[PDB]
Swiss-Prot record, chains A, B:
Underlying gene: fhs
Coiled-coil features, chain-numbered ranges: none
UniProt organism field: Thermotoga maritima (strain ATCC 43589 / DSM 3109 / JCM 10099 / NBRC 100826 / MSB8)
Single Gene Ontology BP annotation: tetrahydrofolate interconversion
Family: Belongs to the formate--tetrahydrofolate ligase family.
Gene3D superfamilies found in the cross-reference section: Domain 2, N(10)-formyltetrahydrofolate synthetase (3.30.1510.10), Formyltetrahydrofolate synthetase, domain 3 (3.10.410.10), P-loop containing nucleotide triphosphate hydrolases (3.40.50.300)
Pfam family, one: FTHFS
Keywords, alphabetical: ATP-binding, Ligase, Nucleotide-binding, One-carbon metabolism
Protein name as catalogued: Formate--tetrahydrofolate ligase
Residues holding ATP: T54, P55, A56, G57, E58, G59, K60, T61
Cross-referenced InterPro entries: Formate_THF_ligase (IPR000559), Formate_THF_ligase_CS (IPR020628), P-loop_NTPase (IPR027417)
NCBIfam families: PRK13505.1
Pathway recorded for this protein: One-carbon metabolism; tetrahydrofolate interconversion
Amino acid sequence: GMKPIKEIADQLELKDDILYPYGHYIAKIDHRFLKSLENHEDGKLILVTAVTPTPAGEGKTTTSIGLSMSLNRIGKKSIVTLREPSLGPTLGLKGGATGGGRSRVLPSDEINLHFTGDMHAVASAHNLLAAVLDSHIKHGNELKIDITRVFWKRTMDMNDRALRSIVIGLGGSANGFPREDSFIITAASEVMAILALSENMKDLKERLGKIIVALDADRKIVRISDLGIQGAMAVLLKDAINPNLVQTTEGTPALIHCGPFANIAHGTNSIIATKMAMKLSEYTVTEAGFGADLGAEKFIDFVSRVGGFYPNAAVLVATVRALKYHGGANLKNIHEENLEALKEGFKNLRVHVENLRKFNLPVVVALNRFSTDTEKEIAYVVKECEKLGVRVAVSEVFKKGSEGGVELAKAVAEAAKDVEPAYLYEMNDPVEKKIEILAKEIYRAGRVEFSDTAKNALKFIKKHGFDELPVIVAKTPKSISHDPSLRGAPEGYTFVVSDLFVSAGAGFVVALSGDINLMPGLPKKPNALNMDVDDSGNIVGVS
Amino acid sequence: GMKPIKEIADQLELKDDILYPYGHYIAKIDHRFLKSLENHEDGKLILVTAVTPTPAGEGKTTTSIGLSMSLNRIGKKSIVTLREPSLGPTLGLKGGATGGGRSRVLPSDEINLHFTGDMHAVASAHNLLAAVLDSHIKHGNELKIDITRVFWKRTMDMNDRALRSIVIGLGGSANGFPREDSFIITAASEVMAILALSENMKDLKERLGKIIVALDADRKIVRISDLGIQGAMAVLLKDAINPNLVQTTEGTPALIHCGPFANIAHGTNSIIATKMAMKLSEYTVTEAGFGADLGAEKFIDFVSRVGGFYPNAAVLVATVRALKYHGGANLKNIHEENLEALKEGFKNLRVHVENLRKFNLPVVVALNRFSTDTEKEIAYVVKECEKLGVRVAVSEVFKKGSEGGVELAKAVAEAAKDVEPAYLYEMNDPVEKKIEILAKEIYRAGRVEFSDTAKNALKFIKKHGFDELPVIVAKTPKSISHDPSLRGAPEGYTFVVSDLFVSAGAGFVVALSGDINLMPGLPKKPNALNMDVDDSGNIVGVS
């Protein structure tokens, strides 16, 4: 029951001269159009985030889409902006990255799979560098690359654990020099973070060239620019920089563009998409990955300053189940009423509301209702929110579309304002200081400790002039802390930083706590088993 | 200075309902349209091939395009069908896969780069199988796959020698089991060959199911269908099965679809594209890879039988320089007149003409003129052709477009006829007899010798019931023989078969002579170094 993309484009007054179709239901918009609009006024920006994620699933993306649909429903022109999902995970398990129920972005199969080929473009560019690096070494290694100190990995958009740790370059002289390597899932690529952060092609190429590839035999930094390949990568990314226009279940507009990780990167869609939506609608609904401790913090302290914007409100997605989980309930019994676990778990919601207010944002709690939620449960969460002084609306967008999101849309429209920016750190505070602030203010730690490895990394960072970059914290999303086992609202603990690295092209330092999974595996019975093209030539099993 | 795809599509009277645009200048045509046209009349099919390829470059693709343009020009409705170029090679070296000069397919950057994503789709399907295979093993290996007897490789569309020989599955229990592996360039995938041979989605899926993945602990064949992923692979290929519509320099139609190798596979575009062109034009001009000993032979003995068609003429592309090279001339002096090397090299042309005649085809020689060519040279070639009893036209399409191709067009239109099919072998002659025939008739060997490895391979083939499959010979293209050293027209030599394998989904046995390079490397100074996006945001350095 879908609108041709030209219809959607018309709603937004987009002309064909800047529209590049992909079939009848998708188009790219020329990114250069954004600069054209530079004298046009920006609308409101609504940041969608969530309580600490649980295995019960909180449906944030579904809620984002539903909010936008509901804003349009109440007569306020709105665009939802989303990350493009990785293909890999879908071949493993059905996921929620294109929403659910009556609150989806469409056409779902295409979005979930090849879409407009942006993931393939990133992989190509990324892998080209790797190929060129090895070939440089093969042909005489003029740059004196130390093959034990290559930071740059290969990539594929596939959930393939077999490629986590490999040995390449075997078979003899004609094949070059043996070394150890790894594949990461393509979304985790610094190329993807860069694509999401670039305003234009010049910006993109400059960023690509800055990427740190390796150390040489004298421990000097080798950059992409030293290989001279940044131009070719840019060419491979020339269409990928243009955001993708699609639609919601209800025929309202959506922009889907880029998919950086929300741990080792900033975890939101491209600044190009967000900025363009802001010129084209009254309410831009944009989400950030993981809980408000990760996605939302990164959105304010980093993305917003790159992008030259600031949210007018934050929506905190919560569920009764998630709160019971955070209160100590078993996942296996989560569908059963438990008002004591609920009361205790509410502390997690409280920390996120408080943290959000540290950024001076008005907050609206979106309580995603499940079938099994009791009225006592819903009533309690609502009352507790009222006592916090936070707007709250119950959301039923999965079941009802915008008819399930009216109260939420009105709360958001009522809450949104122009706020005085309140960043946690100055763009150029020392890395250690930024970390201390984040750990204190957001993760609610009593202190930070750096491992010896991290200490050595900090020395490297200072030596090479990166001590003033913004910091992107890569920690577990399962806790406000660094410890994935700590449910609820841990406080006053010792936050441990295990390591750090520099993403010089993206323009940030990553502070790591524990091991980060950059290449997820396949389950024993993968979703691919369900996938097919039926007798009628329709795709089944994907979404 | 070129035409909106709608204008090309209108030329062929295609409706929007089976057209999927990719930007303003490309469209996919729904493949199911071909079945619609089944009661419609086939036009003529012109097979374009060439003399034994030399490093001097013969410009076969440019000529194929030129010929189609010239036919249109002389009032005969024509479509050119071409393979899609692999990205990988272009990042290493500018090539000729989109033609040259005033005889190209456009838009050429897009065609040479990501195009409509078909390469990516093939790679995804291919790699999915590899990921699932390793994960099956990790999770209990119920199929008892022998990890020393896995035939299936990984793939990327990149010239990466570092990936020719690798070790995967390292790092411990969580990552699964170590094993040896390889990457092959995507073009070389059996999935690519299958895509190019399939008539519809049921066919595709059946074919994929039959692919031999590995042997188990008991030396039993393990097939894709055993893993149950053929449906997911079909899903990933659902758009890739649809041919791509573009145009020539002169705004005439071109279909570009698939890109199998001409050594380990059949070396031409998809049967869907050739078949469709034949319903939509008077003259379908279709190219086959490498010299007439490989691409042309396979086109007649194999592709034609799968496609249910047969050419009406063969065009044999030749150059003065190639002939001199074959007569022993130095590449460095190739520009220098040398009627004696020319006389000697003509023998290569003679063999290909005689061989084409074996298939009962009328032949036209396309003498692709170079600037350095003396009149005395053009004249000698033309006389020698006349004596040989073969039509010959000098072609200047590169320089002059359509204009420079009119003589070739007229000659082709004059020569084309309905012929009695004359295949070299019967579809179910034993593999060894098929090879004997090819070696004798085409490669002009005096006998065939099978290595011990080949003999063992034959035992396998017969054991598992593949002994009556068609045979695709993977040998050097640089000689009519198996020996790349042997220029001109070697005869009476001993043709060596090194090994054999089974492409069960594609439906053929491959017979190998020597090592076949299925993962080319990058040169010391790759073409990537030239690639860029210029201040005006235009791509440079690709073509």
